[PDB]
Structure formats: structure tokens, C-alpha cells
């Protein structure tokens, strides 16, 4: 016989171990593989698809009203419209997105993001907006003079009703953590603010309040690691008809 000795870790069940185990059905022939459309082989394919932000996560926004921001004609210049907190761990506008749900299965993240905004006013509606990204450090900028000093894009509503604000990966560390401290230097991403560059100017038969829809995806330099269970789902009891699977 072969002289052996057992190591520490013998007989344990790690839930992430990668071994071969006993076939319960020998000489079983699985069904032949058929081509099915839309195979996913890496979850970063899913994360690069744009999905709507709930920027209007306020009360008196009921259901689908949370998925759009209503901008109007203003009588003062340089006015703030909305801002977006960029914490993907924390329950903000970025949580229920394709980039936000798959990332909460992980703890560390890296890479650039993109914010796409589609203007959903009338053809007659004109206007210009500035979409600023501010790297972290201080407070969120509240005036336009303060906010345009960071990464921005000026967007006129015309024949193309969409822009992209690339949110660049500007970090000291290779990765950022999904830690509970949103004000941490390893977690805080910065801020996105939108201002009037000119004004939303409509005629008398366009609806005077127009809408934006914000989208967020990840770019192809995006990366996730350290896998954990999602805080988005959970139970304190067995589900209905789960006892009937034992009957």
C-alpha cells in the first residue's frame, strides 16, 4: 500500500471547492446541445448594457415616474436640475441597474462608467444642458461655476436626442470597495450634476415640462471581484408552497 497522512482541511466541505464527484447515473447520455440565441459566458457582457437610473427616487414619484426627470423652463440662469449619487453599494439611483445589480454580488470594482441621457420632449423643444462629473474630495457642487471645473459635456437637444457622460476611472487604488462607509476614500466615486447651460425653450403647443431618461452602463475596462451574496434579496421565513415540495 501507499503510505499517506491526512492534512488539515481533510473531510471538510468548502462550498467553493472544485473537485470531481460520483455520477449518480452511470452511462447517462445528456440531450444534444442546440444553438440557443444569446449565450452569456461572462457577467461583464451583461454589465455593459445600459439600463435606466431612478434619478427621481423621491416621494410623490410613484412607480414609473421615478424613471424620468421632469425639466421645465426657468427664469434664472445657471440653475441646477438634478444630481446623481454614484455609490453602487448604497441604495441610490444606481442600485437597480444592470451595472448596479451584478456589482452587488461583488465587493471590489474598477473601470469606467457611462451615463446616457435621452431627451424625451417634443421636436419643438430646444435647450442646452451641462452634465458634470466631479472627482471626490469635497461637497457636491451646487452652482454651475463650481461644477463645470470637473469632467463635463455640454449637450444641445437636436437631431440626436442623446449624449454620453463618460465617468472616467479616476482612483488612487486599482479597485474601489463596496464598503458601508459611503464617505470613505476607498468607496466614494464622486458626483454627477446637471445644470441649465441655456434654458428649456418650448413654443405654446409643446408641453412646457419635458423629460429626461438616464441610463448607465459599464465600459469594457470594467472589472468586478471578490464575490459575496447580494443584499438585494433575502427571506425571514420559508416561501409559499415550499412545504408542499415535501408533501
Amino acid at each position: 500500500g501507499v503510505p499517506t497522512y491526512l492534512l488539515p482541511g481533510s473531510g471538510q466541505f468548502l462550498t467553493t471547492d472544485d473537485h470531481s464527484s460520483a455520477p449518480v447515473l452511470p452511462c447517462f447520455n445528456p440531450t444534444p446541445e442546440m444553438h440557443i440565441p444569446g449565450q452569456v459566458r461572462n457577467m461583464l457582457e451583461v454589465v455593459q448594457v445600459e439600463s435606466m437610473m431612478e434619478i427621481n427616487n423621491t416621494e410623490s414619484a410613484v412607480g414609473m415616474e421615478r424613471l424620468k426627470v421632469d425639466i421645465s423652463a426657468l427664469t434664472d440662469v445657471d440653475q441646477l436640475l438634478f444630481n446623481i449619487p454614484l455609490d453602487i453599494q448604497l441604495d441610490g439611483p444606481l442600485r437597480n441597474t444592470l451595472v448596479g445589480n451584478i456589482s452587488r454580488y461583488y465587493t471590489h470594482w474598477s473601470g469606467s462608467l457611462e451615463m446616457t441621457f435621452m431627451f424625451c420632449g417634443s421636436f419643438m423643444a430646444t435647450g442646452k444642458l451641462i452634465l458634470c462629473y466631479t472627482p471626490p474630495g469635497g461637497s457636491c457642487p451646487t452652482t454651475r461655476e463650481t461644477a463645470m471645473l470637473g469632467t463635463h459635456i455640454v449637450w444641445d437637444f437636436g437631431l440626436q436626442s442623446s449624449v454620453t457622460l463618460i465617468i472616467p476611472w479616476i482612483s488612487g487604488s486599482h479597485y474601489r470597495m463596496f464598503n458601508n462607509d459611503a464617505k470613505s476614500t476607498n468607496a466614494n466615486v464622486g458626483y454627477v450634476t446637471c445644470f441649465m447651460q441655456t434654458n428649456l425653450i418650448v413654443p405654446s403647443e409643446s408641453s412646457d415640462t419635458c423629460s429626461l431618461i438616464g441610463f448607465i452602463a459599464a465600459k469594457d475596462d470594467f472589472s468586478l471581484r471578490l464575490m459575496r451574496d447580494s443584499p438585494d434579496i433575502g427571506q425571514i421565513d420559508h416561501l409559499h408552497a415550499a412545504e408542499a415540495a415535501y408533501q
Binding site: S20, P23, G38, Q39, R41
Partner: peptide, 30 residues
């Protein structure tokens, strides 16, 4: 390490680095 006679008995196959994001991100035809 697979000493079983069935191919599905083997360990997990973690070497599939083929991606195609364009079937979700650019499904348009032109």
C-alpha cells in the same frame, strides 16, 4: 483529477474566456 467513467462527473470548467457583448450592446443591423 477525474477517475470516473462519465464526463459530467468532472470538476468545473473555468476556462471559457470567449465574450461577445455586441449581441447585447449593438444588436442593430447597420
Amino acid at each position: 483529477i477525474n477517475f470516473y467513467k462519465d464526463s459530467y462527473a468532472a470538476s468545473a470548467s473555468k476556462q471559457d474566456f470567449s465574450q461577445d457583448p455586441s449581441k447585447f450592446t449593438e444588436p442593430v443591423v447597420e
